[PDB]
Amino acid sequence: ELLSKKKIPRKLMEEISAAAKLKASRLFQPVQYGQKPEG
């Protein structure tokens, strides 16, 4: 069923024809207790 669903149609074939170890604290601020995290 997965293979039937995800078979490539012809048009897609025709069209066809940075890592670094960061930390969560470095990018995103911590959230105060009792508050919904938002990002």
Partner: peptide
């Protein structure tokens, strides 16, 4: 002639995925 190659590829792939 790439069109014929794509047609052949598509036909074979559709035949291969068709059967459970």
């Amino acid at each position: 002639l790439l069109k014929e190659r794509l047609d052949q590829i598509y036909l074979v792939n559709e035949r291969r995925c068709s059967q459970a």
